[PDB]
């Protein structure tokens, strides 16, 4: 029916200033700064006060409105991302061949380099995205950890490592071999 207006809030925490012109969003806090283009979506932002920003859609349909919230979220995860920051955890899984995972660099690279997957002589590589940093967990067997300010960049880099270790021509129910995402969360602790 088109709703004459629906809207959402985006809270702002003590460390960060978010600043938005046209629909180009910049959020800047303790852990640095991300920016994200919202031009493709047609909402109206409004600052009410340094810890509060509203987003509204005037005279909109379902599919429209239904993107107002995902706008609210995308901009939140920038603000959380720039305060606490994100950390994705992945564990190796193999039933006979140890999965050897290193970090290598050609021409400034940074590549996740997986060897011996299900035996494979082939040497697998996933590029390290910028913003994201990899630390092989001490004190945890076969745990890789990707962390950074962009949820979207770590989550993706994560999913790229996991997918490089898909299994062919086997019952992928019996052959569970892989590198899987085993925990999603934050950098800064007590939270």
């Amino acid at each position: 029916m088109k709703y004459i207006q629906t809207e959402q809030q985006i809270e702002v925490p003590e460390g960060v200033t978010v600043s938005i012109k046209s629909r180009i969003v910049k959020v800047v806090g303790p852990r640095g700064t991300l920016t994200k283009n919202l031009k493709h979506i047609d909402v109206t932002f409004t600052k009410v006060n340094n810890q509060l920003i509203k987003v509204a859609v005037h005279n909109g349909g379902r599919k429209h409105v239904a993107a107002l919230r995902t706008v609210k979220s995308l901009v939140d995860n920038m603000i959380t991302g720039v305060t606490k920051g994100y950390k994705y955890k992945m564990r190796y899984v193999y039933a006979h061949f140890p999965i050897n995972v290193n970090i290598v660099e050609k021409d400034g690279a940074k590549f996740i380099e997986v060897r011996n997957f299900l035996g494979d002589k082939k040497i697998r590589n996933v590029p390290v995205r910028d913003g994201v940093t990899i630390e092989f967990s001490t004190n945890v067997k076969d745990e890789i950890v990707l962390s950074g300010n962009s949820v979207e960049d770590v989550s993706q880099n994560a999913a790229d490592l996991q997918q490089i270790c898909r299994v062919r021509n086997k019952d992928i129910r019996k052959f569970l071999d892989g590198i899987y995402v085993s925990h999603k969360g934050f950098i800064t602790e007590d939270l």
Binding site: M1, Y3, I4, Q5, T44, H58, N59
Partner: protein, 172 residues
């Protein structure tokens, strides 16, 4: 069927020796002209009583004008309609400024949503929903909230010459 007027129509079974002064029935009828209105009258009447035009007489036809033509009003509307595969009762709510405007857009809506043309529709009742909160359909309720305001974003001005020397702007 066009731009409606509302008519009171009154008819009654041609008199007879043993029954002089038969009983007189009225219908309010939304039609675009009195000719269509008298037709519609006979149409529903042969749907209710044993008469047809042949053996009956229209007694009086009168246009009824809206009582408060510049009063905004919440209309509850009741309709019977035929679809391709069956027939269906139905209730809509319309907000406008006269029963005559309201029936214009109902016929518009029925046609646009259900592909119902005029022949295939029956007005059961149109009546003014007096107390708000007996308004039931949201797409109406929406327009009763206090201190209502809305922008009209992305303005498109109609160009009057083919060429323009600017690049427009939809500010508003």
């Amino acid at each position: 069927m066009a731009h409606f007027k509302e008519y009171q129509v009154i008819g009654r079974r041609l008199p007879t020796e043993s029954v002089p002064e038969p009983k007189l029935f009225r219908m309010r009828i939304f039609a675009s002209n009195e000719v269509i209105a008298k037709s519609r009258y006979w149409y529903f009447l042969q749907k209710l009583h044993k008469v047809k035009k042949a053996s009956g007489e229209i007694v009086s036809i009168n246009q009824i004008n809206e009582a408060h033509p510049t009063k905004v009003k919440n209309f509850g509307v009741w309709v019977r309609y035929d679809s391709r595969s069956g027939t269906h009762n139905m209730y809509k709510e319309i907000r406008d400024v006269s029963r005559v405007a309201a029936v214009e857009t109902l016929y518009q809506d029925m046609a646009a949503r259900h592909r119902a043309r005029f022949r295939s529709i029956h007005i059961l009742k149109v009546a003014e929903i007096e107390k708000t909160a007996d308004v039931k359909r949201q797409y109406v309720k929406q327009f009763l909230t206090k201190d209502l305001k809305f922008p009209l974003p992305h303005r498109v001005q109609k160009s009057t010459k083919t060429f323009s020397y600017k690049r427009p702007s939809t500010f508003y």
